[PDB]
Enzyme design. Structure first.
Site, PDB file in Angstrom:
ATOM      1  N   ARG A  40       6.820   4.315   0.018  1.00 25.41           N
ATOM      2  CA  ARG A  40       6.245   2.933   0.087  1.00 25.41           C
ATOM      3  C   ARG A  40       4.719   3.028   0.309  1.00 25.41           C
ATOM      4  NH1 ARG A  40      11.142   3.564  -1.128  1.00 25.41           N
ATOM      5  NH2 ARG A  40      12.711   1.991  -0.599  1.00 25.41           N
ATOM      6  N   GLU A  80       0.253   0.564  -9.910  1.00 25.62           N
ATOM      7  CA  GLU A  80       0.854  -0.132  -8.753  1.00 25.62           C
ATOM      8  C   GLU A  80      -0.144  -1.160  -8.213  1.00 25.62           C
ATOM      9  OE1 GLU A  80       3.128   2.143  -5.908  1.00 25.62           O
ATOM     10  OE2 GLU A  80       3.298   0.383  -4.624  1.00 25.62           O
ATOM     11  N   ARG A  81      -1.438  -0.853  -8.165  1.00 25.42           N
ATOM     12  CA  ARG A  81      -2.441  -1.820  -7.647  1.00 25.42           C
ATOM     13  C   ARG A  81      -2.479  -3.037  -8.590  1.00 25.42           C
ATOM     14  NH1 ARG A  81      -3.200   2.966  -6.309  1.00 25.42           N
ATOM     15  NH2 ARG A  81      -4.364   3.866  -4.572  1.00 25.42           N
ATOM     16  N   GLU A 113      -1.121  11.161  -8.694  1.00 27.02           N
ATOM     17  CA  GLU A 113      -1.721   9.815  -8.487  1.00 27.02           C
ATOM     18  C   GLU A 113      -2.104   9.733  -6.993  1.00 27.02           C
ATOM     19  OE1 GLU A 113      -0.016   6.625  -7.142  1.00 27.02           O
ATOM     20  OE2 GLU A 113      -1.988   5.682  -7.629  1.00 27.02           O
ATOM     21  N   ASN A 114      -1.225  10.188  -6.098  1.00 29.52           N
ATOM     22  CA  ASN A 114      -1.512  10.161  -4.636  1.00 29.52           C
ATOM     23  C   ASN A 114      -2.737  11.040  -4.312  1.00 29.52           C
ATOM     24  OD1 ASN A 114      -0.015   8.148  -3.572  1.00 29.52           O
ATOM     25  ND2 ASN A 114       1.811   9.349  -3.165  1.00 29.52           N
ATOM     26  N   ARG A 117      -6.168   9.230  -5.805  1.00 27.88           N
ATOM     27  CA  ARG A 117      -6.570   7.967  -5.130  1.00 27.88           C
ATOM     28  C   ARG A 117      -6.942   8.253  -3.673  1.00 27.88           C
ATOM     29  NH1 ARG A 117      -5.527   3.642  -8.669  1.00 27.88           N
ATOM     30  NH2 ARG A 117      -7.474   2.825  -7.820  1.00 27.88           N
TER      31      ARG A 117
END
Length: 221
Positions: A40, A80-81, A113-114, A117
């Site tokens: 999450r 996701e943003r 991606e994690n 960002r």
């Protein structure tokens, strides 16, 4: 491998400047789910709102990237943003590009991606780098190149995994800074690392003081 690093807005925009925009579908918003392989994500609502303001004026400069999953659902590969932003705008549909990614690729993109960002805590960054290296039989340099990072940014992180539990626990608990844990790597000895860890917490030593104590300990015969 290389294409797994290429699904985010900036990289999609850059590829699209050299060629024809991909085919866009307008998928349901209600049918989108975040990458099931990442925890999450707790965004800065402030930054989601800034993004919603931009989109409400200027449109959604890139479609999100999703794969098909379940019964008529779409799993986010990138966006996701954007997905969160268009909920603030009350949209029922969002432009998307569909890619066939298998689970391992979708899991790889979750970590990538994690990392890109700058979300992750130091040990989380370390574990992500370690897994991408293991999954893809990769050089530290090969991974660093694909992430647009220095080989030392990777190594500094990967080395935290070679530290003893107590030091790792202290870093995760934020009882010490990363640069504290980094300096303790130089000692290359559990007992010395633990004794100096207790000193750092007891006397609330800063980085300079810890680095000095590490040199003085390594200067000893």
């Amino acid at each position: 491998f290389s294409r797994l690093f290429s699904f985010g807005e900036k990289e999609q925009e850059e590829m699209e400047e050299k060629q024809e925009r991909e085919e866009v579908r307008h998928i349901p918003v209600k049918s989108i789910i975040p990458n099931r392989f990442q925890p999450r994500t707790m965004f800065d609502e402030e930054k989601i709102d800034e993004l919603a303001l931009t989109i409400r004026t200027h449109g959604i400069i890139q479609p999100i990237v999703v794969r098909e999953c379940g019964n008529g659902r779409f799993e986010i590969i990138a966006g996701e943003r954007r997905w969160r932003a268009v909920q603030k705008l009350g949209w029922t549909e969002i432009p998307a590009i569909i890619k066939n990614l298998n689970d391992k690729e979708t899991a790889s993109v979750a970590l990538i991606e994690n990392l890109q960002r700058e979300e992750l805590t130091p040990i989380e960054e370390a574990m992500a780098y370690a897994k991408l290296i293991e999954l893809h039989d990769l050089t530290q340099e090969a991974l660093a190149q694909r992430l647009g990072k220095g080989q030392s940014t990777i190594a500094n992180k990967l080395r935290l995994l070679k530290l003893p539990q107590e030091v790792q626990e202290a870093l995760l608990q934020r009882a010490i800074t990363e640069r504290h844990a980094r300096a303790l790597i130089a000692l290359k000895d559990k007992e010395k690392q633990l004794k100096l860890l207790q000193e750092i917490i007891d006397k609330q030593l800063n980085v300079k003081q810890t680095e000095d104590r590490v040199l003085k300990l390594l200067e000893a015969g």
